[PDB]
């Protein structure tokens, strides 16, 4: 809802990309391939997250393989489109109103689930868990912290983590 913050995000993202490029010195001229930044870090990339409108050129979408027959040219996404534009992160982050509506729901649903799982006499399983794993006000996977019993004595920790800046 803020346009100035989106423009600042684009400018800052270009700044750190230009810093990497000057680390390769690379030059002022463009067409530095953005696959080196935005590849996940498991395929060798930097793992870089985007919050801007960056598009990849169509000349990056060529690949090939040498089989027994010879060489085969495979191509990604060719019909007529230019819709290859770096998935950005707002689509993949749940808003707060959605979170607050969803969280009461998932905590009541988990309460029903472990209430019927204790009367049907079986311990809770990874699947029924994995239905509601990343949802809640304190996030249902925090029931399964290494130590929930010694964190029940941890009171007033928010003001503590705000005042750690003076320490």
């Amino acid at each position: 809802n803020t346009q100035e913050l989106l423009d600042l995000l684009v400018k800052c993202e270009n700044k750190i990309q230009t810093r990497i490029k000057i680390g390769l010195n690379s030059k002022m001229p463009s067409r530095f391939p953005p696959v080196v930044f935005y590849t996940p870090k498991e395929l060798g990339g930097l793992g870089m997250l985007s919050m801007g409108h960056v598009l990849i050129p169509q000349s990056d979408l060529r690949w090939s393989k040498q089989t027994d027959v010879g060489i085969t040219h495979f191509r990604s996404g060719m019909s007529h489109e230019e819709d290859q534009l770096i998935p950005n992160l707002y689509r993949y982050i749940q808003p707060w109103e959605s979170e607050f509506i969803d969280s009461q729901r998932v905590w009541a649903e988990y309460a029903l689930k472990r209430q019927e799982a204790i009367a049907q006499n079986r311990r809770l399983t990874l699947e029924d868990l994995e239905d509601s794993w990343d949802r809640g006000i304190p996030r249902i996977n925090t029931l399964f912290q290494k130590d929930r019993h010694t964190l029940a004595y941890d009171k007033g920790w928010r003001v503590r983590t705000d005042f750690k800046q003076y320490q």
């Binding site: 010694t150 964190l151 004595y153 941890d154 503590r160 320490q167």
Partner: protein, 56 residues
């Protein structure tokens, strides 16, 4: 009180977790944390003794 000691030492050791270059005072701090983990009742006696006596 042992739960509170574990929580206190976790909050103190969260500070020197990111870095790896530590001088003498940091080393002393982590050594006191490890002694407080390894013998909690001596550390609790010491904490309560400082709370009763020390004012400077």
């Amino acid at each position: 009180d042992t739960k509170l000691l574990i929580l206190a030492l976790e909050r103190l050791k969260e500070a020197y977790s990111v870095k790896s270059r530590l001088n003498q005072s940091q080393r002393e701090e982590l050594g006191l944390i490890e002694q407080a983990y390894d013998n909690p009742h001596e550390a609790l006696s010491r904490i309560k003794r400082h709370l009763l006596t020390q004012r400077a």
